[PDB]
Design a protein around this ligand. Sequence first.
Ligand SMILES: O=C(O)c1cc(Br)ccc1NS(=O)(=O)Cc1ccccc1
Ligand SMILES: O=C(O)c1cc(Br)ccc1NS(=O)(=O)Cc1ccccc1
Length: 92
Amino acid sequence: SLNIITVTLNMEKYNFLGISIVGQSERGDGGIYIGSIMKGGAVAADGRIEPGDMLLQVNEINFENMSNDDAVRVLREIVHKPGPITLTVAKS
Ligand SMILES: O=C(O)c1cc(Br)ccc1NS(=O)(=O)Cc1ccccc1
Ligand SMILES: O=C(O)c1cc(Br)ccc1NS(=O)(=O)Cc1ccccc1
């Protein structure tokens, strides 16, 4: 059953998300997943996003039908800039 949440991290007290991502989307097949979360990042601090959650959107960028390589580069660009980061995930 679909369980999709949108989480805003203010990135004030944290210098990175602290996630690894695996997989990519065949239309409707696979997806980009949170592989691991490290303590001391913004994602661990919030605690709602877990390994096995599917990454759907970050800020104004959709991650459905994005390659894993492209997803890593987009995330680096966003985390290396100041401001809040809004992640939309599908819970496992
Ligand atoms: O080892 C890397 O190149 C790496 C790059 C990114 Br971007 C994120 C994590 C990476 N290493 S890892 O083996 O997955 C360990 C880890 C996992 C989450 C956050 C930071 C490091
Ligand atoms: O901040 C992250 O977790 C991150 C994840 C991915 Br996938 C790609 C880039 C990321 N941010 S980053 O600052 O460019 C590299 C990083 C990744 C994990 C921990 C600390 C730094």
